[PDB]
Short mmCIF file of C-alpha atoms in Angstrom, two decimals:
data_model
loop_
_atom_site.label_atom_id
_atom_site.label_comp_id
_atom_site.label_asym_id
_atom_site.label_seq_id
_atom_site.Cartn_x
_atom_site.Cartn_y
_atom_site.Cartn_z
CA UNK A 1 -19.29 -4.33 3.46
CA UNK A 2 -17.93 -5.34 0.04
CA UNK A 3 -17.91 -9.14 0.23
CA UNK A 4 -14.57 -9.57 -1.55
CA UNK A 5 -12.88 -7.51 1.18
CA UNK A 6 -14.52 -9.46 4.01
CA UNK A 7 -13.47 -12.63 2.19
CA UNK A 8 -9.78 -11.79 1.98
CA UNK A 9 -9.89 -10.51 5.56
CA UNK A 10 -11.64 -13.60 6.96
CA UNK A 11 -9.20 -15.86 5.10
CA UNK A 12 -6.24 -14.16 6.78
CA UNK A 13 -7.82 -14.30 10.24
CA UNK A 14 -8.61 -17.98 9.63
CA UNK A 15 -4.85 -18.48 9.45
CA UNK A 16 -4.58 -16.83 12.84
CA UNK A 17 -2.82 -13.77 11.43
CA UNK A 18 -3.48 -10.10 12.13
CA UNK A 19 -1.02 -8.50 9.70
CA UNK A 20 -1.91 -8.62 6.01
CA UNK A 21 0.86 -8.83 3.40
CA UNK A 22 0.99 -6.29 0.58
CA UNK A 23 -0.99 -8.31 -1.97
CA UNK A 24 -3.73 -9.15 0.56
CA UNK A 25 -4.04 -5.52 1.67
CA UNK A 26 -4.29 -4.37 -1.95
CA UNK A 27 -7.07 -6.86 -2.63
CA UNK A 28 -9.02 -5.09 0.11
CA UNK A 29 -8.17 -1.74 -1.46
CA UNK A 30 -9.20 -2.79 -4.97
CA UNK A 31 -12.51 -4.13 -3.64
CA UNK A 32 -13.30 -0.49 -2.86
CA UNK A 33 -12.15 0.89 -6.19
CA UNK A 34 -8.93 2.49 -4.94
CA UNK A 35 -6.18 3.05 -7.56
CA UNK A 36 -4.01 -0.06 -7.33
CA UNK A 37 -2.17 -1.04 -10.55
CA UNK A 38 -2.06 -4.57 -11.93
CA UNK A 39 0.36 -6.82 -10.02
CA UNK A 40 0.83 -10.58 -10.06
CA UNK A 41 1.77 -12.97 -7.27
CA UNK A 42 4.39 -15.43 -8.51
CA UNK A 43 4.77 -18.69 -6.58
CA UNK A 44 7.83 -19.77 -8.60
CA UNK A 45 10.61 -18.14 -10.60
CA UNK A 46 9.08 -19.52 -13.81
CA UNK A 47 5.79 -17.86 -12.90
CA UNK A 48 7.54 -14.56 -12.20
CA UNK A 49 9.26 -14.69 -15.57
CA UNK A 50 5.86 -15.14 -17.26
CA UNK A 51 4.18 -12.31 -15.33
CA UNK A 52 7.16 -10.04 -16.02
CA UNK A 53 6.76 -10.54 -19.77
CA UNK A 54 3.03 -10.07 -19.25
CA UNK A 55 3.13 -6.66 -17.56
CA UNK A 56 6.35 -5.68 -19.34
CA UNK A 57 9.85 -4.79 -18.11
CA UNK A 58 11.23 -3.10 -16.12
CA UNK A 59 9.55 -4.67 -13.09
CA UNK A 60 9.76 -4.75 -9.30
CA UNK A 61 10.05 -7.90 -7.18
CA UNK A 62 8.72 -7.89 -3.62
CA UNK A 63 8.89 -10.96 -1.40
CA UNK A 64 5.63 -11.68 0.38
CA UNK A 65 5.86 -13.05 3.93
CA UNK A 66 3.72 -12.46 7.04
CA UNK A 67 7.01 -12.43 8.98
CA UNK A 68 8.60 -9.77 6.79
CA UNK A 69 6.23 -6.80 6.76
CA UNK A 70 8.94 -4.11 6.60
CA UNK A 71 10.26 -5.10 3.17
CA UNK A 72 12.83 -2.29 2.81
CA UNK A 73 14.32 -3.15 6.20
CA UNK A 74 14.81 -6.79 5.16
CA UNK A 75 15.84 -5.82 1.64
CA UNK A 76 13.38 -8.19 -0.01
CA UNK A 77 12.21 -5.57 -2.56
CA UNK A 78 14.23 -5.15 -5.79
CA UNK A 79 13.53 -2.36 -8.28
CA UNK A 80 13.98 -1.57 -11.97
CA UNK A 81 14.67 -5.14 -13.10
CA UNK A 82 15.29 -4.70 -16.83
CA UNK A 83 15.36 -8.28 -18.09
CA UNK A 84 14.96 -12.00 -17.50
CA UNK A 85 18.57 -12.66 -16.43
CA UNK A 86 18.43 -9.89 -13.85
CA UNK A 87 15.03 -11.10 -12.60
CA UNK A 88 16.49 -14.58 -12.03
CA UNK A 89 19.32 -13.16 -9.93
CA UNK A 90 17.16 -10.70 -7.97
CA UNK A 91 14.76 -13.55 -7.27
CA UNK A 92 17.64 -15.40 -5.62
CA UNK A 93 18.75 -12.29 -3.74
CA UNK A 94 15.45 -11.48 -2.05
CA UNK A 95 15.08 -15.06 -0.89
CA UNK A 96 18.59 -14.95 0.58
CA UNK A 97 17.87 -11.61 2.25
CA UNK A 98 14.67 -13.01 3.69
CA UNK A 99 16.57 -16.03 5.00
CA UNK A 100 19.03 -13.85 6.90
CA UNK A 101 16.20 -11.64 8.19
CA UNK A 102 13.77 -14.33 9.42
CA UNK A 103 14.90 -17.88 8.57
CA UNK A 104 11.57 -19.22 9.86
CA UNK A 105 9.48 -16.96 7.61
CA UNK A 106 6.55 -18.37 5.66
CA UNK A 107 7.09 -17.36 2.02
CA UNK A 108 3.72 -16.74 0.36
CA UNK A 109 5.31 -15.84 -2.96
CA UNK A 110 6.79 -12.87 -4.81
CA UNK A 111 4.85 -9.87 -6.03
CA UNK A 112 5.77 -8.88 -9.58
CA UNK A 113 4.73 -5.29 -10.19
CA UNK A 114 5.39 -2.48 -12.65
CA UNK A 115 7.83 0.41 -12.30
CA UNK A 116 5.30 3.17 -11.76
CA UNK A 117 5.94 6.68 -13.01
CA UNK A 118 6.96 8.76 -9.99
CA UNK A 119 4.66 11.52 -8.80
CA UNK A 120 4.03 13.62 -5.70
CA UNK A 121 4.40 11.34 -2.68
CA UNK A 122 1.57 11.45 -0.15
CA UNK A 123 0.50 9.19 2.71
CA UNK A 124 -2.94 8.18 3.93
CA UNK A 125 -3.05 6.56 7.35
CA UNK A 126 -5.75 5.06 9.55
CA UNK A 127 -5.63 4.32 13.26
CA UNK A 128 -8.29 3.49 15.84
CA UNK A 129 -8.59 5.45 19.09
CA UNK A 130 -9.94 3.83 22.30
CA UNK A 131 -12.45 6.66 22.83
CA UNK A 132 -13.07 8.14 19.36
CA UNK A 133 -12.88 5.21 16.97
CA UNK A 134 -11.12 5.27 13.59
CA UNK A 135 -9.37 8.32 12.23
CA UNK A 136 -7.98 8.98 8.78
CA UNK A 137 -4.76 10.98 8.31
CA UNK A 138 -3.22 12.77 5.34
CA UNK A 139 0.18 14.34 4.77
CA UNK A 140 3.04 14.37 2.27
CA UNK A 141 5.41 11.43 2.08
CA UNK A 142 9.14 11.35 1.46
CA UNK A 143 12.05 10.36 3.68
CA UNK A 144 11.59 13.38 5.96
CA UNK A 145 7.98 12.69 6.96
CA UNK A 146 8.92 12.09 10.60
CA UNK A 147 10.97 15.29 10.71
CA UNK A 148 8.39 17.57 9.11
CA UNK A 149 5.60 16.23 11.34
CA UNK A 150 2.90 17.60 9.01
CA UNK A 151 -0.26 15.49 9.06
CA UNK A 152 -3.93 16.41 9.41
CA UNK A 153 -6.70 14.06 10.53
CA UNK A 154 -10.47 13.58 10.69
CA UNK A 155 -12.76 11.00 12.30
CA UNK A 156 -14.13 8.31 9.99
CA UNK A 157 -16.54 8.55 8.22
CA UNK A 158 -15.55 11.84 6.63
CA UNK A 159 -17.51 13.99 4.19
CA UNK A 160 -16.11 15.47 1.00
CA UNK A 161 -15.88 18.75 2.90
CA UNK A 162 -13.66 17.05 5.49
CA UNK A 163 -11.51 15.59 2.71
CA UNK A 164 -10.90 18.82 0.80
CA UNK A 165 -10.41 20.64 4.08
CA UNK A 166 -7.87 18.25 5.63
CA UNK A 167 -5.90 18.42 2.38
CA UNK A 168 -5.75 22.22 2.62
CA UNK A 169 -4.81 22.22 6.31
CA UNK A 170 -1.36 20.64 5.90
CA UNK A 171 1.55 23.08 5.95
CA UNK A 172 2.81 21.58 2.70
CA UNK A 173 -0.46 22.38 0.93
CA UNK A 174 1.09 25.15 -1.21
CA UNK A 175 3.38 22.48 -2.62
CA UNK A 176 0.41 20.46 -3.89
CA UNK A 177 -1.19 23.56 -5.40
CA UNK A 178 2.05 24.13 -7.28
CA UNK A 179 4.57 26.69 -6.05
CA UNK A 182 4.39 24.80 -10.89
CA UNK A 183 1.64 22.40 -11.96
CA UNK A 184 -0.85 21.51 -9.21
CA UNK A 185 -1.24 17.89 -8.16
CA UNK A 186 -4.53 16.10 -8.80
CA UNK A 187 -6.35 17.19 -5.64
CA UNK A 188 -9.67 15.68 -6.70
CA UNK A 189 -7.91 12.34 -7.02
CA UNK A 190 -6.67 12.69 -3.46
CA UNK A 191 -10.15 13.62 -2.29
CA UNK A 192 -11.52 10.50 -3.97
CA UNK A 193 -8.95 8.27 -2.23
CA UNK A 194 -9.70 9.73 1.18
CA UNK A 195 -13.44 9.13 0.72
CA UNK A 196 -12.91 5.58 -0.51
CA UNK A 197 -10.63 4.77 2.42
CA UNK A 198 -13.17 6.35 4.76
CA UNK A 199 -15.90 4.12 3.29
CA UNK A 200 -13.70 1.03 3.43
CA UNK A 201 -12.79 1.67 7.08
CA UNK A 202 -16.33 2.57 8.14
CA UNK A 203 -17.62 -0.66 6.54
CA UNK A 204 -14.87 -2.77 8.07
CA UNK A 205 -14.48 -0.95 11.39
CA UNK A 206 -14.86 -4.20 13.34
CA UNK A 207 -12.18 -5.86 11.19
CA UNK A 208 -9.41 -3.29 10.73
CA UNK A 209 -7.30 -1.97 13.61
CA UNK A 210 -5.06 0.25 11.48
CA UNK A 211 -3.76 0.70 7.96
CA UNK A 212 -2.10 3.02 5.50
CA UNK A 213 -1.45 3.59 1.84
CA UNK A 214 2.26 4.40 1.64
CA UNK A 215 3.52 5.32 -0.68
CA UNK A 216 0.92 6.85 -2.96
CA UNK A 217 1.99 8.82 -6.03
CA UNK A 218 -0.18 11.76 -7.07
CA UNK A 219 0.10 13.03 -10.63
CA UNK A 220 -0.83 16.40 -12.09
CA UNK A 221 -4.38 17.69 -12.46
CA UNK A 222 -6.75 15.36 -14.27
CA UNK A 223 -4.45 12.33 -14.31
CA UNK A 224 -5.27 10.67 -10.99
CA UNK A 225 -2.98 8.87 -8.57
CA UNK A 226 -1.64 5.40 -7.79
CA UNK A 227 -1.10 3.37 -4.60
CA UNK A 228 2.40 1.88 -4.46
CA UNK A 229 2.36 -0.07 -1.19
CA UNK A 230 -0.12 -0.64 1.63
CA UNK A 231 -0.38 -2.29 5.02
CA UNK A 232 -3.45 -3.45 6.90
CA UNK A 233 -3.46 -4.70 10.50
CA UNK A 234 -6.57 -6.66 11.48
CA UNK A 235 -8.29 -7.02 14.84
CA UNK A 236 -8.43 -10.53 16.39
CA UNK A 237 -11.70 -12.57 16.96
#
């Protein structure tokens, strides 16, 4: 069990919380070498302005709050912020939106991240079954994920064989192979194995989680995790 992960996890539980906010989840992910790009947690608008200049515009602002896990629903995530004036106004907006959504929300800060180059959207999920333990799922992302109902699964821990196999079993597999340039399958295989390892190590800690969205680029150029959620088990 990578100590850094257990540390961030314990810290959250110590606060009597089960749901981890995006930046906390990603700390767990990074501790296992998963592809999470550099992002900074601003506690003030001045801090955000600094970090923005640091990572370079355009940037994304995402309000962090244990009470506001579904950021898009609350509208506390603002994209493609091109400059300092716009960042100052979007900073005000997300706080207002969070106030209308959950006025009693604890605001942990605002995540300042980069505008990642889009790629093939995929989703990696993890749930725990009462009888079989943790399972890892894979399928394409997009806004029609619930309509297409195309996900494959395997029990954790999985082998590389399981990983390559579950990737090929989805109906949308031909799309990844390029129906066109094929996506970076090996990169996906690596993510599945790392999540499998992370979950196996922390099986007594994590109830469920997912990496959504994840962008997968063409062959040989890896992938990147855009958002993630981790739900911890109590006591």
